[PDB]
Amino acid sequence: VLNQPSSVSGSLGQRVSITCSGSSSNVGNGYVSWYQLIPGSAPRTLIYGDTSRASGVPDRFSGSRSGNTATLTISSLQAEDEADYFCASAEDSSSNAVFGSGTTLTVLGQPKAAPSVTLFPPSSEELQANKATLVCLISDFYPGAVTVAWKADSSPVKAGVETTTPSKQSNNKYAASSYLSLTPEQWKSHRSYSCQVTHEGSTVEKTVAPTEC
């Protein structure tokens, strides 16, 4: 496996570089490739033959190699460049490919945004199926690091909680979701339930009550 940095970060409009270190039998042979993997889409070939730009790739992407170390350089860093990046090389055969450990690229400089939080109580249908699920959706926030807590009445509750990792939307802001799995009896006993989303020191709390509909 070709050693790459686990995660790098750059600023919008700036220039960033990602290294790919191997040995004399692969990257030293002198034919390194680079691929961009955006969450959801198919892998995209960026560079082949150390320096050759792939078809349709913009000129902002550049490839270089020094000895046993290749480098992918992205100039004029755009927001759509947030992705994983992998290097690859043949080794002792044109059919024996070895990939790199991958590098996650984080693009900085985008506007900050407080999260919009929506707390759905258990639907009537789900309660009629002897199940209760409190859903807490968190949309339109940046940076993509939030922390969710759950309150039964006003006490903290931790059992039955499942929270997703923030993932980017089509508008390039981050989104996350949290679930509190309750039996209908637990949903009826307490007077209220609350979802607390903490983002950059601010805490937005939404609350639903079983007394309402």
């Binding site: 496996v1 042979n29 002198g30 034919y31 490739s33 691929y35 993997l37 198919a42 892998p43 995209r44 070939t45 082949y48 033959g49 992998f86 690859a88 090389s89 043949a90 080794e91 002792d92 055969s93 044109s94 059919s95 024996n96 490919a97 070895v98 990939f99 790199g100 450990s101 991958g102 919009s116 929506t118 707390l119 759905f120 639907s123 249908e125 789900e126 199926a129 199940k131 699920t133 859903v135 959706l137 949309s139 499942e162 929270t163 997703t164 990792t165 993932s167 939307q169 089509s170 989104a175 996350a176 979701s177 679930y179 799995s181 309402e212 509909c213």
Partner: protein
């Protein structure tokens, strides 16, 4: 246009042989070599194998004893087989057109170039690796013979879409779709958020659209959580006008191909 589509099971029991098929489009298999690449959750890309125009196959060494790749130019298909699968083989599998080429070249060491002239320009006659700057034609430290070297060229041209394969002894389960209707206190001014909760399905993936793809403004299908039961749950949300609640109907279209299930759930407004 060159396309490659993967097909096969979304779920395979441990110890079984995962078999996948790649349908090629826009080119002849007798022209471009076709290979397979997988990625496990949180793991790097991993090479599997390839078959070229001359039907010769080449595999990842560490997996060669379990891999078999065949090709049919007539049906224009490429088949992959991985035996004795385990949970470590749960991954996304792509097929793709790959460039492979061996180059049986001649090579000179560093500081030496293939020439028949010294640094000053005196014609030595014989072509050989001569030291850059050297002034003698046959001095020991001014020449060496060309060494035959093989240079390997590899890259991945066009990637397929990617098929998610899950290896587990647990059985398939279809999803249960519940509504996430916005109440009067849940709105956000002129707009409101409403969605669908897709509970308890296995295995992944599940895709959700809204109003048969006609409603795209604000749609976001969240990642799935794995509950302690081994089943997945997912949510999808869409932003609609608050004034239209009660008038315009909204329906989420959930698709779970691993179980051949499609659910169109109508999210009706809360009366409060």
């Amino acid at each position: 246009q060159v396309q490659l589509r993967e097909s096969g099971p979304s779920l395979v029991k441990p110890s079984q042989t995962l078999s996948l098929t790649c349908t090629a489009s826009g080119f002849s298999l007798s022209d471009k070599p076709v290979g397979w690449v997988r990625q496990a959750p949180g793991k790097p890309l991993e090479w599997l194998g390839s078959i070229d125009t001359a039907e010769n196959t080449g595999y990842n060494p560490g997996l060669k004893s379990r891999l078999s790749i065949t090709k049919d130019n007539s049906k224009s298909q490429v088949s992959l087989s991985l035996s004795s699968v385990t949970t470590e083989d749960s991954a996304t599998y792509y097929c793709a057109t790959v460039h492979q080429k061996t180059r049986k070249e001649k090579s000179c060491p560093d500081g030496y170039l293939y020439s028949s002239n010294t640094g000053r320009g005196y014609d030595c006659g014989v072509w050989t690796c001569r030291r850059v700057g050297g002034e003698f034609c046959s001095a020991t430290g001014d020449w060496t013979s060309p060494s035959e070297e093989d240079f390997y060229e590899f890259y991945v041209d066009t990637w397929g879409q990617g098929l998610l394969v899950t290896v587990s002894s647990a059985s398939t389960k279809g999803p249960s779709v519940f509504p996430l209707a916005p109440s009067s206190k849940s709105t956000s001014g002129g707009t409101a958020a409403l969605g669908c909760l897709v509970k308890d399905y296995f295995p992944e993936p599940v895709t959700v659209s809204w109003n048969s793809g006609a409603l795209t403004s604000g749609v976001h299908t969240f990642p799935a959580v794995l509950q302690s039961s081994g089943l997945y749950s997912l949510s999808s949300v869409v932003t609609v006008p608050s004034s239209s609640l009660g008038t315009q109907t909204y329906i989420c279209n959930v698709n779970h191909k691993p179980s051949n299930t499609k659910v169109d759930k109508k999210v009706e407004p809360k009366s409060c």
